[PDB]
User: What shape does this take?
Amino acid sequence: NMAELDAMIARVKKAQEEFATYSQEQVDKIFRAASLAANQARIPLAQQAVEESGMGIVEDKVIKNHFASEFIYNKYKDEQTCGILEEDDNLGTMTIAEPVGIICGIVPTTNPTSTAIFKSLISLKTRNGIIFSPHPRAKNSTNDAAKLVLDAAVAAGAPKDIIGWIDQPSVELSNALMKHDDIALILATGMVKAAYSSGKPAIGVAGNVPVVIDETADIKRAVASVLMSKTFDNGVVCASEQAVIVVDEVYDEVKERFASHKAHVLSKTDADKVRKVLLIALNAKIVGQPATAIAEMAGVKVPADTKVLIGEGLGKVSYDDAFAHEKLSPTLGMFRADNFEDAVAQAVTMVEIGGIGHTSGLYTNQDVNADRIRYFGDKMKTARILINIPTTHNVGPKHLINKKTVAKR
Amino acid sequence: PVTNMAELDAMIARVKKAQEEFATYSQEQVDKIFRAASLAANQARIPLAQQAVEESGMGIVEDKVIKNHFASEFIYNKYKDEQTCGILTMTIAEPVGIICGIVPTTNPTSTAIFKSLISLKTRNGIIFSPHPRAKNSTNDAAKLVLDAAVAAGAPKDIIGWIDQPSVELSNALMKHDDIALILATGGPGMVKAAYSSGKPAIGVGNVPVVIDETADIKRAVASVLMSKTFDNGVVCASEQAVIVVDEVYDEVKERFASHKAHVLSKTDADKVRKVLLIDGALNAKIVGQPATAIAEMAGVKVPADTKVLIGEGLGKVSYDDAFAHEKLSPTLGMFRADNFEDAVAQAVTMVEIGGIGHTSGLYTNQDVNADRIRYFGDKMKTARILINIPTTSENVGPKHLINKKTVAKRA
Ligand SMILES: [Cl-]
Ligand SMILES: [Cl-]
Assistant: This one.
């Protein structure tokens, strides 16, 4: 509630102030102890996450947790985040680190535990406080993830309230935490929009990813490549390919190949029963569900061993086509293109859905289409451009400190 | 002619197309536009300065001449050779799109120059939203840069502006689908409005100085005043108050009369406060006015030759004392500290009052007091920290006006 939010915030403020003065050695001891404990809990937390949210796959969520813990630990074990980062005694200058203070972490339904572990460990490493604003749908997964890391932290010497959370999440409390004066940064992983509209320094962490397969591509490789992501944690991953935009001459060959990967191409009529279930705004009930259960939410009989649903668009890429949108599930759109340039044009449109200009992909004969690649590179407004490569082929400590420069006469 | 919504939208579309064409330009073509437009802007150094002072009613013509110079020639020499287009697996620089420049009355011509130049250098389009008290000199500095870019071959609508600025349109420009970035300078309000726009936004603080007992007082006093009269103290990140340790307080205060800095009586100080802030905000009518004029509007008598007003705090730095605020004028608060740590503590509040901490300074004996320097370093939540040096993130540049894109190939 509104009142007890303030009291919890002022606790972590003072706890951060105590934390700020710590030695790198105590920071390191806490970091390792918090990370080793999160890793050792990879399975229990993954299991808890699956059951509460009611989506995804334990074994894949176990992998997610191991990455957010041991992998983060090994990347930043030796990264300097405190004190003098640079000196030049001749110029009489130096750069000094400064923790940002208190972080506000927005955690989604989609990766409740791994994102909490990740943000917790990188806050601890940088002498920050962090407060989690979980999604109702996975409140306990993330807060118990936060708690496990807290308790391991407190036991290696960390201040009592260096991490907290909103126990019962609301729109009032999320907005209270965000616009609060002593919260310095938003780490936000639509909900992106709220963070950027709050007056705060914000880092937003998804986006719509199109894939163009042109006439010169290796069809068998492109098709397997594009499919790699869709089944991992039931397609719950941020950078992933949402639709295939295929040049006419190679269209049918792409469509036929899907079937040897257990990707079921939905008839026109069965695609419309899925398309009415994907969107209403993305429907939370399909998010991170297997292809077979999404089909059974729709009207659609699909073979038992199917891993992915393919819904092909009549007409071009259109806002009205839900298969043209980000689906967070084992689903892909498939859209027909007159030629390479047309497919590029259709990709541009998918990118505009999302506002987020994240990543795009092209499958083509590299050896002979250098012009096309450069063309593709000049026309995609996405930070990452992938050629013949899937998205499964970056917030860090450095973002949660301030560099202060000191100049002496 | 942009005085309303259908006209703003219509103008935005013309810049959209201009930027589309400009995106295609070569680095050579860009260089030529960049040189030509910077040279023209510099050549209009004086007439644009004069226009600025006349219209906004503030500042010093020949100080704004220097501002217009540094926004033009200096910006040119800094970035003549900087790569902004093309190749940098591979990295491709690309223009952000259309920029929204928010231009304040304090620097109406130099910021429109600067912003236009680095926008041109990056193949972006830019549309300015001036403040109504300086709208002509802002839009005409814009026009002059535009005309010279166009004559050097830049697309027609590449720079735009709102002819009759208003809240609804300013808000609309920032919120418009087709604006990629907001470059917002000026007031705490506007800057924060750019941060709440839900768009990528760059904003262009209240600067405390501590003078402890170990300092060189002659030097500290002199250095602290250097910024104060430049364009009547409209100077980004110049000193706003001295916080002085009690042991050397009368010494510092005594040296102020030597430098044309009049120390206000407790009574006069009170009169000046009420004129400094109005409705909690910096009073527009004192900004960029000389010390004597600010004395006149407060109804306070001051020698004809005085350059800076000094208002002494009664007690410690506090939100309630207008001299603890950013004043954008030749005026300085002066506050008493019991000792060095108490000084640092009052400086901390001044950084809080300013909002975002940006710069702070300490004068000490740096060849004895290393512990104090480090101590001041730790407590000061400011990007820049200066020891024994006047103020006289980093700077906004082309770097900020492009998105970098990585292409990854498959072996
Ligand atoms: Cl997870
Ligand atoms: Cl100016």
In short: Chain A touches chain B through 32 residues (CB under 8 Å). Chain A has two domains: 1-208+394-409, 209-393. Residues B 52, 64, 67, 107-110 surround chloride ion (ligand 2) (CB under 6 Å). The first strand of chain A starts at residue 84 and ends at 88.
